[PDB]
Amino acid sequence: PHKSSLPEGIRPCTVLRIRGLVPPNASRFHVNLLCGEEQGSDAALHFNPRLDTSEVVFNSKEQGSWGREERGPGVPFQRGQPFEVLIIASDDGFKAVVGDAQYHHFRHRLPLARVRLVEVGGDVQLDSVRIF
Amino acid sequence: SNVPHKSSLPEGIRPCTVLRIRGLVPPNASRFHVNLLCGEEQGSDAALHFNPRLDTSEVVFNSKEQGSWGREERGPGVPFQRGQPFEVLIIASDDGFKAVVGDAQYHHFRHRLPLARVRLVEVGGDVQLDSVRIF
């Protein structure tokens, strides 16, 4: 349940560096770009590695309802293995990088200038969260 | 050692491009460089010259256009040490290049040449290169 508050939002070319360890029997974890600390706040990005189902789900949340799910190729995560993730906020969308390779491109659905908070949750052991 | 390392970038880079350079500074290194150049041709213009200097304990940013070097900028201190590995991000944005070293933003180098003119990434000097990734 890590929260990084982002007053004045994030301007494009923002890099999110997420370093951590995947627990040995972890189910799934998530990184969300939300518009506020409130519960029903809109999710500009929902990045959801799911090891139980062996997938990685991208989505957004608007007006309390989830949008269409996108999925990337395979799972660049392993139970008991560390990981580094970049989330590059561009004009065209979000570039998710895992390890040394770009994993998926999630095109914008909500205005990027609405993101007010970064939340990291789930079965993840967080080492560091940096925003450049 | 992987120097001089060259990564050719036809069709350029669009903004919000992240350059990840990882390597080791050898035990008796003097200085090394990372250049965002406009072509493989000799004496090609340098949109960015990122120049860690361990012998003089400085880090110099500059650009080169039409064969002439611009004015040098300098960052705070040297986030590099002989005998220690390093990671550097060069975030090509709309306003310029954000140089991140380790866990901290180090310096912002405003554009002097059009960002869309960069055609090559070169890494040279007293550096033992681990990887150059472009996202």
Residue numbers in the entry:
A (entry chain B): 4 to 135
B (entry chain A): 1 to 135
Task: List sentences quoted exactly from the publication behind this structure.
pmcHuman galectins (GAL) are oligomeric β-galactosidase-binding lectins assembled from small (∼15 kDa) protomeric carbohydrate recognition domains (CRD). Among prototype galectins, galectin-7 (GAL-7) is recognized for its preferential expression profiles in normal epithelial cells. For example, while extracellular GAL-7 can trigger apoptosis of activated T cells following binding to glycoreceptors via its GBS, it can also bind E-cadherin on epithelial cells independently of its GBS. In this work, we studied the impact of homodimer interface mutations on the induction of Jurkat T cell apoptosis, allowing us to positively and negatively modulate the biological activity of GAL-7 by designing a covalent disulfide bridge (G16C) and destabilizing mutation (G16S) to control homodimer strength, stability, and biological activity.
